[PDB]
Amino acid sequence: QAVLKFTTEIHPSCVTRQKVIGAGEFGEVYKGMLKTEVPVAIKTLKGYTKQRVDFLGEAGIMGQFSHHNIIRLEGVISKYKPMMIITEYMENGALDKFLREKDGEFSVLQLVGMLRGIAAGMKYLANMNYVHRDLAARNILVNSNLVCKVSDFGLSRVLEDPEATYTTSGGKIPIRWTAPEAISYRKFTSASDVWSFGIVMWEVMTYGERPYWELSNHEVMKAINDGFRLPTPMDCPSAIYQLMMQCWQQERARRPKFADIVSILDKLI
C-alpha cells in the first residue's frame, strides 16, 4: 500500500540490462529486456541509504496511471540488489535533448502534435487529482513514433476542490518552470502545472532553448513579477503563442484548464 499497488514485483532473473542510457539522481538508467520478451528502461538505485523510500514511491505513484501519454510501469524489484524500476522503453529519450538534436527537422504542426499528447497526459493527471510540480521538457519522454509521454513523478502530490491546493513546506523546485504564486506563496495547483505547460510549449517551439536563456533564477523571478513574459519563438503561429500567454496569466484562475488546452491544440492541427 505504501506503495504495493499497482506495483507488480519482478524477479531479477526476468531482467537483462544491456547498456547505460542515462544517469538519474538515484543511479544509472539502463536499456534492457524483460520477460514474462520486451524492451524496457530500468532505473537503479546506487550505498544509497530513505533515498530508497523516495525511489520506490515514484513507482507507486506511476503504477496508479494507465494512459497513452503517461509512462507505463512494468514493475519493480524491491527484494534484491540493486533496486530497480522497470518502465516502457522510449527510443528518443528526453524531449529537450531530442529537439536540440533534431532542430529544424520538425514542422510546426508536428511540434503541436507533441504538445497535444503532453496536454492529454496532463489532463488525465489532473482528473486523477494529481499535481505534477515538475513539468519540463526534460521530463517528457519520446518514443520512436514521436509520441510524447509525461514521466517524472517524484514531486507529484494528491489534491483536494474549489481551491484544490498543495501548500509545500519547501524542497528543491525547477524555478524557471514554476508559477509565480507557487514560488512566492508555495501554493501548487493544476493551474500552476498549466503555467509549467506554457514553458514546455516554449521549449518545444524553440527546439530546446533554455527558458530565460542565461538569466539567473534571481533575475527570472524579478522579471516574471515585473510582467516580463517569454517572447514569441521564431516561426511560431500567433495562436500558439497566444495560448502560451494564457498559460502565463499572473492570476491562476485566468489560465486555461488542461481540457481546454487539448481542444485548442486539436483545432490548430
CSV table of C-alpha atoms in Angstrom, one decimal, residues 67-237:
chain,number,residue,atom,x,y,z
A,67,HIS,CA,-2.9,6.5,-20.2
A,68,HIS,CA,-1.4,6.7,-23.7
A,69,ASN,CA,0.7,9.8,-22.8
A,70,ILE,CA,1.8,8.8,-19.3
A,71,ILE,CA,4.9,6.5,-19.0
A,72,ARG,CA,3.8,2.9,-18.3
A,73,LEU,CA,5.1,1.0,-15.3
A,74,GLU,CA,6.1,-2.7,-15.9
A,75,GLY,CA,7.1,-3.3,-12.3
A,76,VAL,CA,9.7,-3.1,-9.6
A,77,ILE,CA,12.5,-5.1,-8.0
A,78,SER,CA,12.5,-4.3,-4.2
A,79,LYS,CA,13.6,-7.6,-2.7
A,80,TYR,CA,17.1,-7.8,-4.2
A,81,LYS,CA,20.0,-5.5,-5.2
A,82,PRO,CA,20.3,-3.1,-6.8
A,83,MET,CA,16.7,-1.9,-6.6
A,84,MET,CA,15.1,-1.4,-10.0
A,85,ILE,CA,12.0,0.4,-11.5
A,86,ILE,CA,11.1,-1.0,-14.9
A,87,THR,CA,9.1,1.2,-17.4
A,88,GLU,CA,8.3,1.1,-21.1
A,89,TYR,CA,11.3,2.0,-23.3
A,90,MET,CA,11.3,5.3,-25.1
A,91,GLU,CA,13.7,5.3,-28.1
A,92,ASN,CA,14.2,9.1,-28.5
A,93,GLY,CA,14.7,9.7,-24.8
A,94,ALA,CA,14.1,13.1,-23.1
A,95,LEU,CA,12.2,15.7,-25.2
A,96,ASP,CA,14.5,18.7,-24.8
A,97,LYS,CA,17.7,16.8,-25.8
A,98,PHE,CA,15.8,15.3,-28.7
A,99,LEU,CA,14.6,18.6,-30.1
A,100,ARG,CA,18.2,20.0,-29.8
A,101,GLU,CA,19.5,17.0,-31.6
A,102,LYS,CA,16.9,17.5,-34.4
A,103,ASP,CA,16.5,21.2,-34.7
A,104,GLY,CA,14.5,22.4,-37.7
A,105,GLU,CA,13.6,18.8,-38.6
A,106,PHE,CA,10.0,19.0,-37.4
A,107,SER,CA,7.3,21.1,-38.8
A,108,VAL,CA,5.3,23.5,-36.6
A,109,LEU,CA,2.3,21.1,-37.0
A,110,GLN,CA,4.3,18.1,-35.7
A,111,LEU,CA,5.5,20.1,-32.7
A,112,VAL,CA,1.9,21.0,-31.8
A,113,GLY,CA,1.1,17.3,-32.1
A,114,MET,CA,3.8,16.6,-29.5
A,115,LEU,CA,2.2,19.2,-27.2
A,116,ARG,CA,-1.3,17.8,-27.7
A,117,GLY,CA,0.0,14.5,-26.3
A,118,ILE,CA,1.6,16.1,-23.3
A,119,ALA,CA,-1.6,18.1,-22.7
A,120,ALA,CA,-3.6,14.9,-23.0
A,121,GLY,CA,-1.4,13.2,-20.4
A,122,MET,CA,-1.6,16.2,-18.0
A,123,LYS,CA,-5.4,16.4,-18.4
A,124,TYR,CA,-5.6,12.7,-17.3
A,125,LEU,CA,-3.3,13.5,-14.4
A,126,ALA,CA,-5.4,16.4,-13.2
A,127,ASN,CA,-8.6,14.2,-13.4
A,128,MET,CA,-6.8,11.8,-11.0
A,129,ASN,CA,-6.4,14.8,-8.7
A,130,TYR,CA,-2.7,14.9,-9.1
A,131,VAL,CA,-0.4,18.0,-9.5
A,132,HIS,CA,2.9,17.1,-11.0
A,133,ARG,CA,5.0,20.1,-10.0
A,134,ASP,CA,7.9,19.2,-12.2
A,135,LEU,CA,6.6,19.5,-15.8
A,136,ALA,CA,9.5,20.3,-18.0
A,137,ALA,CA,10.7,19.1,-21.5
A,138,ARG,CA,13.5,17.1,-19.7
A,139,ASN,CA,10.7,15.1,-18.0
A,140,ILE,CA,8.7,14.3,-21.2
A,141,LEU,CA,9.9,11.1,-23.0
A,142,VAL,CA,9.6,10.5,-26.7
A,143,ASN,CA,9.0,7.1,-28.4
A,144,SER,CA,10.0,6.0,-31.9
A,145,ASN,CA,6.7,7.2,-33.3
A,146,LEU,CA,7.2,10.7,-31.7
A,147,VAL,CA,4.5,10.1,-29.1
A,148,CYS,CA,5.3,12.2,-26.0
A,149,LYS,CA,4.7,10.8,-22.5
A,150,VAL,CA,4.9,12.5,-19.1
A,151,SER,CA,7.5,10.7,-16.9
A,152,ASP,CA,8.9,12.1,-13.7
A,153,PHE,CA,6.6,11.6,-10.7
A,154,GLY,CA,8.9,12.3,-7.7
A,155,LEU,CA,7.5,15.8,-6.9
A,156,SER,CA,3.8,14.7,-7.5
A,157,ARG,CA,1.1,15.3,-4.9
A,158,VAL,CA,-2.5,14.2,-4.4
A,159,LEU,CA,-5.0,17.2,-4.2
A,160,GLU,CA,-8.4,18.3,-2.7
A,161,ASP,CA,-11.9,21.2,-4.8
A,162,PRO,CA,-12.8,24.8,-5.3
A,163,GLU,CA,-9.2,25.6,-4.5
A,164,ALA,CA,-7.6,22.1,-4.6
A,165,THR,CA,-4.2,23.3,-3.3
A,166,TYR,CA,-1.0,21.6,-2.3
A,167,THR,CA,0.9,24.0,0.0
A,168,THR,CA,4.5,22.9,0.3
A,169,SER,CA,6.8,23.4,3.3
A,170,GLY,CA,9.6,23.5,0.8
A,171,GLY,CA,12.1,21.5,-1.2
A,172,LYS,CA,14.0,21.8,-4.4
A,173,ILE,CA,11.9,23.1,-7.3
A,174,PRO,CA,12.7,23.9,-11.0
A,175,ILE,CA,12.5,27.7,-10.7
A,176,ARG,CA,12.2,28.6,-14.4
A,177,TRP,CA,9.2,26.3,-14.9
A,178,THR,CA,7.2,27.2,-11.8
A,179,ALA,CA,4.2,29.5,-11.5
A,180,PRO,CA,5.0,32.8,-9.5
A,181,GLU,CA,2.4,32.0,-6.9
A,182,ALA,CA,4.0,28.6,-6.3
A,183,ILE,CA,7.4,30.1,-5.8
A,184,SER,CA,6.3,33.0,-3.7
A,185,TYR,CA,3.4,31.5,-1.7
A,186,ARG,CA,4.1,27.8,-2.1
A,187,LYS,CA,0.6,27.1,-3.5
A,188,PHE,CA,0.6,24.4,-6.2
A,189,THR,CA,-2.5,23.6,-8.3
A,190,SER,CA,-3.2,22.1,-11.6
A,191,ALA,CA,-3.2,25.8,-12.8
A,192,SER,CA,0.5,26.0,-11.7
A,193,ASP,CA,1.1,22.9,-13.8
A,194,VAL,CA,-0.6,24.9,-16.6
A,195,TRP,CA,1.9,27.6,-16.2
A,196,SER,CA,4.7,25.0,-16.5
A,197,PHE,CA,3.0,23.6,-19.6
A,198,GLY,CA,3.3,27.1,-21.2
A,199,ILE,CA,7.1,27.0,-20.6
A,200,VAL,CA,7.2,23.5,-22.1
A,201,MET,CA,5.4,24.8,-25.2
A,202,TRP,CA,8.1,27.5,-25.5
A,203,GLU,CA,10.9,24.9,-25.1
A,204,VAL,CA,9.2,22.9,-27.9
A,205,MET,CA,8.7,25.8,-30.3
A,206,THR,CA,12.4,26.9,-29.7
A,207,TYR,CA,13.8,23.4,-30.3
A,208,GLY,CA,15.1,23.0,-26.8
A,209,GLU,CA,16.2,26.5,-25.8
A,210,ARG,CA,16.7,27.0,-22.1
A,211,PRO,CA,13.8,29.2,-20.8
A,212,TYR,CA,15.0,32.7,-20.0
A,213,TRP,CA,18.4,32.0,-21.6
A,214,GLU,CA,21.3,32.8,-19.2
A,215,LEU,CA,19.3,34.9,-16.8
A,216,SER,CA,19.9,33.7,-13.2
A,217,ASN,CA,17.0,32.3,-11.2
A,218,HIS,CA,17.0,35.5,-9.2
A,219,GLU,CA,16.6,37.7,-12.3
A,220,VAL,CA,13.9,35.4,-13.8
A,221,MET,CA,11.9,35.9,-10.6
A,222,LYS,CA,12.1,39.7,-10.6
A,223,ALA,CA,11.3,39.8,-14.3
A,224,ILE,CA,8.3,37.5,-14.0
A,225,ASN,CA,6.8,39.7,-11.3
A,226,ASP,CA,7.6,42.8,-13.3
A,227,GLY,CA,5.3,41.4,-16.0
A,228,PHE,CA,8.0,40.0,-18.2
A,229,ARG,CA,6.9,37.1,-20.4
A,230,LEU,CA,9.0,35.0,-22.8
A,231,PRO,CA,9.0,36.3,-26.4
A,232,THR,CA,7.4,34.5,-29.4
A,233,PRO,CA,9.7,31.8,-30.7
A,234,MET,CA,10.7,32.2,-34.4
A,235,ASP,CA,8.0,30.9,-36.9
A,236,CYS,CA,5.6,30.3,-34.0
A,237,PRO,CA,1.9,30.7,-35.1
